[PDB]
Amino acid sequence: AFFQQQQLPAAMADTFLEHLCLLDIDSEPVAARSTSIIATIGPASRSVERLKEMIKAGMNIARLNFSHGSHEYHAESIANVREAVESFAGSPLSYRPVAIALDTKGPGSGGLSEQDVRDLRFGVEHGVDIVFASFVRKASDVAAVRAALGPEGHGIKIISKIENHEGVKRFDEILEVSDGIMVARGDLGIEIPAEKVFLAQKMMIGRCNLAGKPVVCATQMLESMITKPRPTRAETSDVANAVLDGADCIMLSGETAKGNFPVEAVKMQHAIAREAEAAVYHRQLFEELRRAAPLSRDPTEVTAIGAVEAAFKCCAAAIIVLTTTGRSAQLLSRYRPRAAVIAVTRSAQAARQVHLCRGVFPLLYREPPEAIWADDVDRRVQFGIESGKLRGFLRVGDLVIVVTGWRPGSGYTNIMRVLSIS
Amino acid sequence: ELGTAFFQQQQLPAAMADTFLEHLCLLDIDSEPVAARSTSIIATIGPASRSVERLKEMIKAGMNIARLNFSHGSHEYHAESIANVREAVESFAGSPLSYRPVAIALDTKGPGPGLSEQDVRDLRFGVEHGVDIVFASFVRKASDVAAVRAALGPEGHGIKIISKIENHEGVKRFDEILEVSDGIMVARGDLGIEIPAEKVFLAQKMMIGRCNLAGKPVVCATQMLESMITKPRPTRAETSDVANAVLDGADCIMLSGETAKGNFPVEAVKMQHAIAREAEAAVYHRQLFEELRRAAPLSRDPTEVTAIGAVEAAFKCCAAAIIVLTTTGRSAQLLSRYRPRAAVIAVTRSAQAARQVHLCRGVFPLLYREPPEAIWADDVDRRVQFGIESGKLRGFLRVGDLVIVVTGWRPGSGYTNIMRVLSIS
Amino acid sequence: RADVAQLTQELGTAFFQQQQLPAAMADTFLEHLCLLDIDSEPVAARSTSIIATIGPASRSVERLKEMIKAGMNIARLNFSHGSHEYHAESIANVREAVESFAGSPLSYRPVAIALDTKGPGSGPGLSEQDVRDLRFGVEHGVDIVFASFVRKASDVAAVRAALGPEGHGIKIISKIENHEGVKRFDEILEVSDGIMVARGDLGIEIPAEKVFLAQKMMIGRCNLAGKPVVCATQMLESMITKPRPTRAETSDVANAVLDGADCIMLSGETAKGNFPVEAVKMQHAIAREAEAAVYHRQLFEELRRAAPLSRDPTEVTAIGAVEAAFKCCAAAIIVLTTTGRSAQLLSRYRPRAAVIAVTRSAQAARQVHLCRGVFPLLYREPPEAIWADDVDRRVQFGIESGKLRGFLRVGDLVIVVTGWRPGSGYTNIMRVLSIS
Amino acid sequence: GTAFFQQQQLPAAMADTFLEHLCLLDIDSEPVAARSTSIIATIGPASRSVERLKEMIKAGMNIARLNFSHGSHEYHAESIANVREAVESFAGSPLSYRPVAIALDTKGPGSGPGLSEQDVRDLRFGVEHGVDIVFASFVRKASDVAAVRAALGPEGHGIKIISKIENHEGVKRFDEILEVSDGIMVARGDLGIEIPAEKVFLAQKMMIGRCNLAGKPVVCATQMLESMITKPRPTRAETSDVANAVLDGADCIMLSGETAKGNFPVEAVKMQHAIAREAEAAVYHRQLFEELRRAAPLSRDPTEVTAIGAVEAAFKCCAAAIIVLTTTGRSAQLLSRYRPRAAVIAVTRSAQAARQVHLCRGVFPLLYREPPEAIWADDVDRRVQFGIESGKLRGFLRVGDLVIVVTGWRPGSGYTNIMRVLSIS
Ligand SMILES: O=S(=O)(NCc1ccc(Cc2ccc(O)c(O)c2)cc1)c1cc(O)c(O)cc1-c1ccc(O)c(O)c1
Ligand SMILES: O=S(=O)(NCc1ccc(Cc2ccc(O)c(O)c2)cc1)c1cc(O)c(O)cc1-c1ccc(O)c(O)c1
Ligand SMILES: O=P(O)(O)OC[C@H]1O[C@](O)(COP(=O)(O)O)[C@@H](O)[C@@H]1O
Ligand SMILES: O=P(O)(O)OC[C@H]1O[C@](O)(COP(=O)(O)O)[C@@H](O)[C@@H]1O
Ligand SMILES: O=P(O)(O)OC[C@H]1O[C@](O)(COP(=O)(O)O)[C@@H](O)[C@@H]1O
Ligand SMILES: O=P(O)(O)OC[C@H]1O[C@](O)(COP(=O)(O)O)[C@@H](O)[C@@H]1O
Ligand SMILES: O=C([O-])C(=O)[O-]
Ligand SMILES: O=C([O-])C(=O)[O-]
Ligand SMILES: O=C([O-])C(=O)[O-]
Ligand SMILES: O=C([O-])C(=O)[O-]
Ligand SMILES: [K+]
Ligand SMILES: [K+]
C-alpha cells in the first residue's frame, strides 16, 4: 500500500517518459503540501474571522500590496493577520507561523521612488518579514531597497520582482544580490510578448533552483475564481505546472484580495500543489541538483547533501533540522528531498521567513530552556518529533534524519544522525 | 558554414544542454523561433466562425482542423458549416504559397450504456459528407470504439477515430481504448467534473505520454484560452496552459467556445499559433529522442526502421526538412512519433490523407495532383522535387540546405524502406 | 566548470590536475578515458590490498619486514604444500616481522594471515586433510580461510563446521575454480564472507578465453553485494624469473583494480620467485595508478541506484558519509568499528577518501584489509570512565595518526562516523570536521 | 526466438547500468557474430613459409606486419611475395576470398631528430612493392608524419600512415599527431621503457578513447600473448590483456614474437581470434552508442549523415549486417566509428581498399572482380547481391535476416547518400 500511494510507481521509473505513463489519478498524495501559498490581503480577506479560515485553508504568507491603500489601512491588515495567527498559539505542537510580505508600488516613470522609501520605512517599523520589490531592473535597484530598509531592517528578505525585458536580461546580477525572485507575470506579460512569458518563468525558476534561492510564481493563476466558485482547466494546469517547474511559492492576488471565493482559491492551490509535488520526478531531479551543486568546504552545505542522500536511502519521513536564521533548512530544501524538512527554531521571524523555501515546515520552539546545551538540543529534536507525530508527518517505526551543530549560534551545522521513531 | 546567428535562434543553446535543469536555465526570450509551427490547431465552428469570410481569416491565422460539435445544431446547419469550410479552403487553390488542406472533424453528442441513436445517425451523416475524423464522446471501454467503428458503415473505414477520455472509467481503461483507437482527446471539460479538478493535469500528462509512446495522435482540449471568449488578450494561466500542453507532447491543441461563440475567434487562433511556435523550439529534443528510442520496442517493419534512421540523420545535419512520400499518411506518422526538429513534408496524392496527417505533430501535407509518369522512378523523383520546390516557395528550404528523403522500393502503400540525404540545388 | 570553480580557487589548479581528477569529473565514460593523463600523479594511499604467498623466497623475518614495508597486507599460507610444522614457523616469522613495528602505535601496520586449503581433490566435499588443516588454522589464530574448489553452499557450511565454535570470527573467502562454482555463484556468495577468482584452475576447467567474463561478473556481483573479492594467479607471472613484468601483466593488474577487486594476489611470484619484494612493489605502484583512474562519477551513481533501499542505520549513515566526502573532496572518513562492519559498509560505496578504521580488535584490524580503502588503526588505550570521552579520544587518535601518516593536513575536511551507544551495530552518526 | 536473446551476451546488453551489465555476463552465452577486431601478425622465420601463411590466413590473420628493424630489402621482398602467394591461393573462390593487408613497420629515427636515411630508403621500397600501410616508429610530433608522407612520394598517396606512439613526447603531442595521421599504434614495448611501466595502461586507454572519438583506427601492440612464443597456452594475464584491449576499443590487436619467431604462430592467431570474439559480445553497446553519437560533431557531409542513420536503423531491427559499397574504404570507416553490432560488409573493386579496411573494427572486406555492367544501377545491384551471397556462405547472413544497404547516387568516391532496409531472400 505504501508503494502505491504518492505516485511512487511513477517515482521508480527509469525514464521521464515512463514516469509520465505511470502517473495515476487513484494514487493519493500522503506528504504534507510543500509549496507555500501567498495570499494578497484586501477587502475580501481582511477580517480576523476570514483570515482564520484562510490560515486553516493553507495560507503561509500574507501579501500587502502597497500600490493601493494608506499606511493606516495596511497597519490594520497587519494587526488582523497577527490576531488571526495568534488565535491558534494555544497549541504549540500545531501552531502555524504566517509571514507578512510588503509588495512595493514601484518606481513608476522614475530607481527607488520617494513613496517606496516611506513604505519600506513603514515595513521596518511594523516588523514585516519580506519585501517583494517591484520592477527590479538591475543589482543597484536591490542595493537601494536594502539601504532604505536601514540598520533595523537587516533581517528582512528581499524578493526581487522581474517584470520587464531588462530584469530578465540582467537576471543573473539581480539574483546574486537578492534573497529570491518573483516571476511577476502581470507586468511581464505586457512588457514582453505574452507568448514568451512561459520561457522567462521556466528559465528563472531553473536558475533559482540551481542557486538554491526561493522563487515565487505569481499572477492570474486562478483568475476566474474572482467571480466563479471553480477554476478553469487552464488555471488548474497553470498551478500544477508552476509546482512541477520548481516554484518554491505560488501566489493569489485578486483571487483573495477582492474576489468572492478567497478561501476556496487558497483550498484549490493547496489541493493542486499536493498532487503536483507527488508527481515530481525525484529520480532525475535529485541527480541533476546533486551534479549541478558545486563542490563545497562549508560544513552546513556538506552536511545538507549527506542528510538528503541518507533520507532518500531509507525513505525517511522527515529531516529534522535545528536552525537560528533558517539557513540550514534552506540548504536541505535546495536538494528537493521527498522527506519533509521540519525546521525547529526559536526565532519567530526565521519561522515565518522559511515559508519561502519549498518543503520547510517551521516549528516555533517555546518550551523552557535546558541548563545543559546538549540536553537543550535533544529537547528541540524531541519537540520536532512530537509535533511531527501530532501533525501526521511521523509515526512510530519511521526513520528520520536529524541535522544539528557542534556549538551554539548560527553557522556551525555539521552533524547528521539516523533516528528510529519511538 | 551556418554561422553563430543560426545557433542562437530557435532555443538551440538550450537544445544542446547536457541536463534538463541546464536546458531550462538556457531558455531565452530573445531566441526567436524559425521553424514552421508543428502542433495543429483545431477550431470549433459556430455562429462566430461560420461565414466564408471569417473562415478565410481563420485559415490564414493557422486553423488546420475544423471541429463540428454535434451536441448542438441540426444536420442542415452542420452541412452548411462543412460547405463554408470547403469554400474558404478552395479559395486559396490559385496560390501554392497559401493553399492548405483543412481536415473536418465530427465531435459526437455522446451516450445510455453505449452508442446512442443520435450518434448512429450523426456518424452516418459524417460518412455521407466525407468527414476526415470523428472525436467520439465519452469513450469508456474498447467496445465503445468498436461500436463507433461499426457505425462508420461500409464507406467510412478510412475515417480516423479519436477517442475522447472524459471520465474515471475512460482513464482507468485507457490502454484498451488506445489499442483500438487512432488517437485520443483529453476532454478536460467533462473530465474536470467527473474526477477532482486538481487531478486533471495527471490524467493529461499520463495520456499524452502514453500516446507519444504508442506513436498515436493526442489532442489537448477545453478552456485553453477561455477568457478570450470576451477579452482580446488571454490570462497568464492560459498562455502557460497552451505552452505546457505542447511541451507535454500534444500533437494538437483545441479551441471550443473561443472560436465557436466568442468575440475574438481569429485572435484566439493567432494566440495558439504564437505560443505553439515558441513552445516547440523549447522542447528538450536531446532527452526526448533518447527516451523515445529506448522505450520504443525493436522492430522488423522497414517503415519503422527507416523512420528512426531518417530522424537520426536529420538531427545529425540540422536538416531543414524530411520529405516523405505517403499514400495513407503512415510513413509520415512514423517519422512524427520520433519528434524530429526538422519539418516532415508529406507528399501525397490522397486528399484525405493530406487532411488527416494534420493530427500528427510536425507533418506538413502537400497534395500532389500531376498525372502519373509511365516510369515509376520518374514519378517518385517528380514528387521529391515537388516537395523541394514547395519547401523553397514556403521558406522551409534554400539552395545549399540538406534534406532527408524517405521513399519505398516499389509502388503502393506499405513498402517504405529508403532514406536518402540530398543537397538542395 | 561552475560545479568546481570555487573549490578550484580555494584548493588550487594543481590539486585538480593530480590523481586523475580531470578524468574523474568527466561527463561521459568516453571523455573520462580521453582525459586519463600519464602526468597526473596519484596522491592517495594505496587502497587495494596485496596478498603475498609465503614460501622459501619470503619466509625469513628480515625478508618479511621488507615485504611489509613494500606493501604486503595479507600473508597467504598455501596448505597444498608443506607440513603443519613448516606453516607454524611461517606464521611465527610473519608475527615477529609485524610486531617489530609495534613500538609506534600511530604508525603500526596490521598484517592478516590467510590459510589456503588443499581442496577436495577427487572427492565430493570436505577432505580429511582439510579438516585437520582447518583445525590447525583455528589453533594458530588465522584471520581468513581461502577455501579451495567451492562448488555449492554446502561446501562453505562444511568449512564453517570444521572451524568449530572457536573459529566463528574467521572470514571464509570461497575460491571459484570451476564451471559449477560459477553457475552456483549466487548461493555461494550468500553464505560466504567473500570470493576469490582463482584463475589458475578456472582457466583449465573452463575455456581460457572465457575467464575474463567470469572474473568481471564475479567482481561486479561482489561489488553489488558489498562483499570482498580477490583477483588471483599469474598477475605478474614472468616476475618469478625476471625483474620486470610484461606489458600484459601490468595491464592485468591495472584492469583487476579497475574491474573492482578489493584485493590482488601474488603466488609463485612471492613464494618461490627471485624478486618477491619487487613483485609486491610493482603491484603497489600499479594499484595506486589504477585507483586514481576509477570513474567514480558513474561508479557511485550505479552503486547508489543498484543498492536496495535500507532501514539499517549503519547502511544509511555510510551512504550519507560517502556522499559528504565527495562533496568536499574529504581527505579521509574516520570510522569507529568493533567488528569492521561499519568500515565495510563505507568501502562498498567506493569513496575516493581513505577509510581510517579505529578499532580495539586486533583481529578486525587484520581482517578489514579484505575491504578496499580501509586503513586499520589498532587502538590500545584502556577505556575512559565516560563513554562519550572514550569515543572522542578514539576520533582524535584517528586524526593524529592521519596527520602523522600524511593522510590529513591542517585545513582538510574529514568525515567522522560513530554510533549512539557502545557495542557493535549502532553506527548512526556522520560529522563534518575541519582539521586544525 | 528466446534462443537468439540468450546468445552473444544479449541479457547483459539489455542492462540499465554498467554494473548490472557486468553482473549479467554469462560464460555459457556463446558468441554468434563474426570476430570484428583485426589481427596483425608479424612475419618472420616462424611464419614465412607459403604453407604456414595459408594456415595463418585460415586462423584469422588480417594484416601481415614486416618489421624493417630486422632483415634486408631482399628478405622483405620475399616475405611480401610469400604472403601474396598464400593470399592468392584462395582467389579461385571469390565468395570466400580473404584480403590480407601488408604493413611496413619502420626501423625509426634512432638517435636522430627526425626521418632517418634508412627510413627514406625503406619507405621508397614500400611504395615500389605496393605496401598498404606504414607503421611509423617513434612519432613524436606532426612534422614526423609529414616527413613520412613526403618520403612516400606522389605514388604512395594512398598508403595509410599509422603513427606509433612510443615515448613521453608522442603521448604529450598526441592530438597534433592524430590530426595528421590515418591512425595510431600504442607501441607498448618502447612505451613501457620510455615512461614508468605502471602508467602504460593510462596511455593505452587514453589513446584508444581519443581514436574512437576521432573515428580513426587504433592498434594495441606488444607482449599480448608473450608466453606463447614458447608455450602452447597463454597466461591468465595475457588472455585478460587481449580481452581488455578489445573492451577498451582497439580496432586491431597485434602479435610480434608470437608469430615472427615463436613455436605457436598459428595457435597465437587462433587465441587472439577466440578472445576477441568473446570480448566483442561483452561490449556494453547501450552506453557506447549513446556516447559516440553525443560526442560526434554535427555534420553536413552526406556520407557521415547516412552512416549514423544506417547504424541507428541496424540497431532498431537487430540487422545481421550493413552492406556498403566503397571505393576508398571511407564509407565503411564512417559506419565502423559508430561501433554497430551488425557486421559491416564492405564490397569494393579496389584491392588496396579491401586490404586497408581491416584497420577499422567490424569491417569485412569483399573484393569484387567482375567488370562493370553497362547500366550503373545493375552494377550496384550485382555488387550488393555479391555481398549477400558471400555473407550467406560465410555464416554472416541467413534467409529472413534484415540487412541495411548503404550506396551512393553516382559512380566514384565521395557520393554515399542512401540507406535501404532489405529482407534476405
Ligand atoms: O526531455 S524532456 O523535456 N524533460 C525530461 C525531464 C523532466 C523532468 C525532470 C526532473 C527535473 C530535473 C531538473 C529540473 O530543474 C526540473 O525542474 C525537473 C527531468 C527530465 C521530456 C522527455 C520526454 O521523454 C517526454 O515524454 C516529455 C518531456 C517533458 C515534457 C514536458 C515537460 O514540462 C517536461 O518537464 C518534460
Ligand atoms: O564507471 S565505470 O567505469 N563504467 C564505464 C562504462 C560505461 C559505459 C560503457 C560502454 C562504453 C564502452 C567504451 C567506451 O569508450 C564508452 O564510451 C562506453 C562501458 C563502461 C564502472 C562502473 C561500475 O558501476 C562498475 O561496477 C565498474 C566500472 C568499470 C570498471 C572497469 C572497467 O574497465 C570499466 O569499463 C568500467
Ligand atoms: O541554520 P543556522 O542559522 O546556521 O543555525 C544552525 C545552528 O543551530 C544549532 O543547531 C543550535 O544552536 P542554538 O543552540 O544557538 O539554537 C547550532 O549548533 C547550529 O550552528
Ligand atoms: O505511408 P504509406 O501509405 O505506406 O506509403 C508509402 C509508399 O509511398 C511510396 O514511397 C511511393 O508509392 P506510390 O508511387 O505508389 O505513391 C512507396 O514506395 C511506399 O510504400
Ligand atoms: O562496525 P561495528 O562493528 O558495528 O562497530 C560500530 C560501533 O562502534 C562504536 O562507534 C563505538 O563502540 P564501542 O565503544 O563499544 O567500541 C559504536 O557506537 C558502534 O555501534
Ligand atoms: O566510400 P567511398 O570511397 O566514398 O565510395 C563510395 C562510392 O561507392 C558507390 O556506392 C559506387 O561507386 P562505383 O560504382 O564507382 O563503385 C558510389 O555511389 C559512392 O560514392
Ligand atoms: O506586480 C505583479 O505582481 C505583476 O505584475 O504580476
Ligand atoms: O467534450 C469536450 O470537449 C470536453 O468535455 O472537454
Ligand atoms: O588455486 C588457485 O589459487 C588458482 O587455481 O588460481
Ligand atoms: O615498436 C613496437 O612495436 C613496440 O615498442 O612495442
Ligand atoms: K505592488
Ligand atoms: K460534442
Ligand SMILES: [K+]
Ligand atoms: K591451495
Ligand SMILES: [K+]
Ligand atoms: K620496427
Ligand SMILES: [Mg+2]
Ligand atoms: Mg507588477
Ligand SMILES: [Mg+2]
Ligand atoms: Mg465533453
Ligand SMILES: [Mg+2]
Ligand atoms: Mg586452484
Ligand SMILES: [Mg+2]
Ligand atoms: Mg618500438
